[PDB]
């Protein structure tokens, strides 16, 4: 080393080295490239911790703050707003389940609510409940010596996930998530008074954002997520050995500003000796709905759906009575999962950042605060949909709700699949963008990238939907270009 000097080694070694070692640029063309390969199998099921578009509220008028009062009392109060109950009957079965146990659980819970006083409600450990909350289902731990010579002792199943196919419903769910409602869902804490002009401007712009966002259905999911996950974390930490009842509550204000408490259903928490951040709490979700599962039965694999009552509704011209279903299910969560569910409000930031940047981007070039134009001077000009007519341009207020819904769904259906997919497809998008900027994009091993992407599309409705969206986008780009 000390007495080394470079004569001309690298060039000699390059001379010696084989010509199969090459970085051959294949020039890239979006018109040439094919659609991403979606997986096939059984259709993908709903895997949320609470019902989305198919949720149903029993609501009551209530002037309380947006986290005040005794939640069981608020629940009881909501229960009374529904008149026409029934005897419970199973209408859509949980194929792998003891479907009696759900029907007994509902009644046990529904009676336990009627027979309680105070704040805390713990159910009694009945076998049918124990089964649904997975009591004892951990195998008993032993030293290896003492179980060396058992025949069927294997290592735990460690295969990849079973592939699944893109059902429609997720796009529907997103389409609803992307819509306005007739209720204010988000209630922001106070700020320091404005002094700087830019603060006034900021607040002016923030009012619009709050307007477009607080009514958006995504925001209703955010609040449910936050309440459920806070409640569940807290109860998990405080009552490790009890089966605590947590009523699924949100508080809102009508378009009148009249304050309202909603009850979506009940959650029965299992035992929660949560040590590692991945350790699981089993729980039972019991949620009201008007939706008939049987018209989209693939969507509800994990659920046992009971019929629990009836009520009247008016359409445009006609008016008719419908039955009310209770979607019952066993589900699970983890300290890390619910910690992140508590923080879902950050979606608002993800959404609003992108919009504010788009407003500012124009405001710069127009040399003027372009907010009130963008929101008030209503012009449909950002492509945000695809109909049988074709590509559908929307408004900034829509873009807010779309991006918010995206960010929310990214939170609700978080998954290594999405994690990879999102990371890799970005490169393909950038390769498209480079072509569409006429920068002569080149790739070395494209099908490697296609396989790296396609590797991450296994069984997640959200990731499937995104894969699909990418294809629709690719085609949409190909058409306009070719």
């Amino acid at each position: 080393v000390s007495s080394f000097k470079a004569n001309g080694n690298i060039e000699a070694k390059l001379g010696a080295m084989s010509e199969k070692v090459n970085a051959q640029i294949e020039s890239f063309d979006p018109r040439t490239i094919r659609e991403l390969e979606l997986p096939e199998g059984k259709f993908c099921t709903q895997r949320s911790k609470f019902l989305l578009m198919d949720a149903m509220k029993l609501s009551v008028l209530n002037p309380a703050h947006e986290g005040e009062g005794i939640p069981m009392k608020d629940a009881k109060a909501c229960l009374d707003t529904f008149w026409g109950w029934k005897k419970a009957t199973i209408i859509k079965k949980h194929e792998k389940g003891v479907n009696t146990n759900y029907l007994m659980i509902w009644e046990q819970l529904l009676e336990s609510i009627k027979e309680m006083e105070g704040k805390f409600l713990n159910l009694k450990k009945t076998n049918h409940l124990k089964w649904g909350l997975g009591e004892g289902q951990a195998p008993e731990k032993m030293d290896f010596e003492d179980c060396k010579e058992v025949p069927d002792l294997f290592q735990y199943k460690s295969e990849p996930p079973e592939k699944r196919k893109l059902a429609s419903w997720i796009q529907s769910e997103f389409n609803k998530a992307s819509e306005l409602t007739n209720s204010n869902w988000i209630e922001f804490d106070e700020l320091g008074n404005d002094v700087a002009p830019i603060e006034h401007i900021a607040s002016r712009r923030r009012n619009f954002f709050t307007a477009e966002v607080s009514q958006c259905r995504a925001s209703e999911y955010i609040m449910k997520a936050v309440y459920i996950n806070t409640a569940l974390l807290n109860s998990s930490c405080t009552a490790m050995e009890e089966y605590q009842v947590i009523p699924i509550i949100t508080k809102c204000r009508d378009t009148s500003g009249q304050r309202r408490t909603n009850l979506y259903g009940f959650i029965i928490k299992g035992r929660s000796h949560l040590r590692n951040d991945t350790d699981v709490v089993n729980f039972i979700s019991l949620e009201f709905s008007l939706t008939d599962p049987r018209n989209e039965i693939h969507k509800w694999e994990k659920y046992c759906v009971l019929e629990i009552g009836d009520m009247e509704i008016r359409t445009s011209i006609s008016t008719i009575m419908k039955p009310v279903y209770l979607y019952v299910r066993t589900n699970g969560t983890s300290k890390i999962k619910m910690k992140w569910g508590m923080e879902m409000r950050r979606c608002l930031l993800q959404s609003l950042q992108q919009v504010e940047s788009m407003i500012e981007a124009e405001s710069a070039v127009k040399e003027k605060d372009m907010t009130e134009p963008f929101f008030r001077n209503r012009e449909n000009d950002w492509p945000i949909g695809e109909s049988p007519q074709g590509i559908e341009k929307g408004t900034i207020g829509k873009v807010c709700r779309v991006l918010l819904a995206k960010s929310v769904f990214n939170s609700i259906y978080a998954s290594a699949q999405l994690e990879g997919f999102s990371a890799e497809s970005r490169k393909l998008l950038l390769l498209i963008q480079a072509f569409r900027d006429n920068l002569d994009p080149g790739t070395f091993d494209l099908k490697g990238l296609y396989e790296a992407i396609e590797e991450c599309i296994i069984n997640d409705p959200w990731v499937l939907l995104n894969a699909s969206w990418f294809n629709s986008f690719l085609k949409a780009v190909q058409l306009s270009m070719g």
């Binding site: 000390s2 390059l14 199969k20 950050r346 998954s415 480079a434 986008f473």
Partner: protein, 748 residues
Amino acid sequence: MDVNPMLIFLKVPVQNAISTTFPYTGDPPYSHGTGTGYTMDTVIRTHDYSSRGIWKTNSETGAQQLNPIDGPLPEDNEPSGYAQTDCVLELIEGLDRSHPGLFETACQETIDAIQQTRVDKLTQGRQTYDWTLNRNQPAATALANTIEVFRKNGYKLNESGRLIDFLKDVLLSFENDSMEVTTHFQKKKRIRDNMITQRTIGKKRVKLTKKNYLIRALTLNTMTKDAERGKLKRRAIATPGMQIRGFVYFVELLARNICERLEQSGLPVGGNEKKAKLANVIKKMMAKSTDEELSYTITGDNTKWNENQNPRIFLAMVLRITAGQPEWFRDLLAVAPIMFSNKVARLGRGYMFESKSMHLRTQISAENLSDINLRYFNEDTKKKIEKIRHLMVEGTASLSPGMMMGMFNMLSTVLGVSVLNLGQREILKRTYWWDGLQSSDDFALIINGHFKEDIQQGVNHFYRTCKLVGINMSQKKSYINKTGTFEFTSFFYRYGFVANFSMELPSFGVAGNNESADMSIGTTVIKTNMINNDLGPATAQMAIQLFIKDYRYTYRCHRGDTNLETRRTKSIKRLWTETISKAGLLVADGGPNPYNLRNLHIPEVCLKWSLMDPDYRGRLCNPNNPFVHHMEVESTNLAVVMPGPAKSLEYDAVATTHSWTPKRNRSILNTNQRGILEDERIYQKCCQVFEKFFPSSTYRRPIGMASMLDAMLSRARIDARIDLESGRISSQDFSEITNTCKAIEALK
């Protein structure tokens, strides 16, 4: 209509709406159970890439060591580890040529460093593998244990108090064949009750073999990396031992001083500076070119960066960089590459088995992977066992070729940088030429020339020139286009660097240090993002708004005029009604939020100072309060954050009764390490009292080789004297204090 957020990309350029592709508002992926499979996958793949190299048994260890360096050149694109020492040395020389007197000053600094370095500078930093306990431990302990064991055996140069005198001992400790360690174990006595069994811990001396100690001192620990974004499958990270740390520190300290004076080195500088270097290189690469030349940027990732970075190459590098300097210094730094080239890797927790019929589960030590029937396992696993067994030594697995994430840094970049620094017109003298920026596996390379084929030539040339030093460009993930747009470590340049706010979203929330700190952090997160990542006014306002909501809920410190019902709300109500000037109360005491865009840089206490009730502030800032525990200046107002591996975060706050620490983990109480708590409890009470005799000790570390008591006494005299002589004390009290000072000194 069906909504497709990606359709935005029709109108808006990807880089301008890149946020929508970053799903960072949901829980990231986390490994459950063990990462023995991943460690074995890494160890396997690592040899699998170097398979053509030469196998040899180590005499001192007996490990199957594969050597690929200077081996047969690869004849396909696949990930190869066949680096060429001459081809390295050429580049490392070309670097010296290109930077006149770099290595001189670089070394000259490291010399004075090595001379001036205390042992204390090793108690700082990350967790290390503690060969004493066969587990990971905090640096301060993991060191203290090795020093105590070194002291119990015949090794006490470090008693000097200088890092090289410890660093010496480590090489001598390889000689002692019978190394004495004290192991702890649980026993069970029988106690009466005015009769029940009683657990209690006892100690047991064990002596380890040359074979063992040498393995243990060349052992690196493995884990699964959790919370890793962007990736479908989990990866195996590693942790270094207590021996190699001291050398790694100096090698990295040299490689740092090397990097700090290189335009193509991404490390150790922050994103703003990285972007400035990436500007500089483009500005220069344009300003040097001619109007009839092309410019192509490669968005570049290097596949299997660690797996194919060899320690012998690092030996070559570290030697060649030191060439000309004192041979003790040339040797000292060469230790780490060697010790790495003889590295063995622990295989983690092992495996867990389940019986469906019996409904029982059991755990298995990785150490048991030698003597174990393969009927339990599946194909992929049992085959990984089959492959690992041939490399397996005393519980661990030999790992001569390559490297593993988390053990070594920076120098690996210098190898990349040198391949960039090769591409000057003045060196290459071809029709083409190049420049760029690199950090670890991530690189941006601008290639200039006269024609597309002329660029292609430079691409191939670069790509092979890397292969020759064991660097493998990812043909899958890397790509190329005309200079104008590129990606680099999640920075996006589109005729200028755009914003990527989504990256930072996880930072927005209650950090969970404490009421004081969190309030300072949360605001600064909003503040720095407005500056650095285009977080606009209206959204920033809303981030304040949500932060406040999260902070209040998390700490149960809602505003004193709310009707919410928690464990605090009453005692906060009392304070609320009691208080005259409400606006002065902190948020943590149910006061109002003062923050808006202009206030974000002003600490809450400082901001609300004038508006406080002078009683309330006098209670709040009462330096006699028991909730705070007195820090040291180096660790006052500091937190920990992860962007990179793991970094400290300074924050601005006034020490209030809200500057507390939360309760410690207690799971150790059940373990055999139960004594460490008592050790700590005692150890602290010595320093606590010592600080009364040397208040200066908490600001600067007292350098001194003398018995901790003797120092206390020697002072305890003169303080007690000078308090009288030229002061205000009685000579009965002086005589009493000196009588005490003698009276204790009598006791051994």
